[PDB]
Design a protein around this ligand. Sequence first.
Ligand SMILES: Nc1ncnc2c1ncn2[C@@H]1O[C@H](CSCC[C@H](N)C(=O)O)[C@@H](O)[C@H]1O
Ligand SMILES: NCCc1c[nH]cn1
Length: 286
Amino acid sequence: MRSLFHGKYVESFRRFLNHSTEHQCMQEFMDKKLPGIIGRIGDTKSEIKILSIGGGAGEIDLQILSKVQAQYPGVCINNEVVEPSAEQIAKYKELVAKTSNLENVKFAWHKETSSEYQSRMLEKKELQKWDFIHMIQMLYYVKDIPATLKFFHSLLGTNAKMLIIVVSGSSGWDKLWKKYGSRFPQDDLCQYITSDDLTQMLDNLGLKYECYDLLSTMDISDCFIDGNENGDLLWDFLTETCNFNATAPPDLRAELGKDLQEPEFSAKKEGKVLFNNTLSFIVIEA
Ligand SMILES: Nc1ncnc2c1ncn2[C@@H]1O[C@H](CSCC[C@H](N)C(=O)O)[C@@H](O)[C@H]1O
Ligand SMILES: NCCc1c[nH]cn1
């Protein structure tokens, strides 16, 4: 039972992406919801400051940027990215150099974690203000979430908004983690969190937010067959384990095999087993 954490991770992650509607789900939220969300973040401003936490390869960031530009044509935008992976940054830069209509947008990449960024910003004398801050699918890697939430919320300017996206409390992950979390290998780099944990922390912090869920799925049909390589790749992903099927206790595996087909974990339709990958979109007000 080795923690999926790194060449196997990318391979499993990739498998996850091409077998789920995660990409499409996000894109759908951007088209239908994002406009309404960022509708007034640029009001009275001659420059819009966007802070991307864990921006990764930049696909979602550029989609976000397109909506802001559409809402505020002619307005300069400063899009700063906090990302610890040099590899991700390289991809992000490659994408930018490839995209065309980005004249009024300037980028800056800071190779560090949100925590390092936070302490670095606290060494400065006064904290900057941002019009839009987003943390997409990255809170799992933050050690102190309440401090992180409080800090970034304090960086929001007038009418600014903070967008956070993590899996939903009503997704299969939530159930998978609550029940088998302790039986999966642990890595000090990742912790299980869902919108339930998040809204609870936001409630205790006393911050105002709205939470929207968007159904997304992961086709894990291939997970039900000895040998199938893709199924095994997905097995590894769902368990954050390297070669789950070959190293995990048979009692664990067997039990998992059963639960993954239960209504609360997946839906069965068209002879397919679709793991509930519902995502939660949380918008926090300044
Ligand atoms: N503590 C931390 N602070 C900021 N970013 C972090 C981090 N730990 C990991 N990350 C970054 O978090 C990202 C998680 S993948 C997140 C998805 C990405 N926002 C996009 O939508 O594609 C990766 O780029 C990873 O390097
Ligand atoms: N759909 C979210 C993918 C993910 C990241 N970590 C765990 N699961």
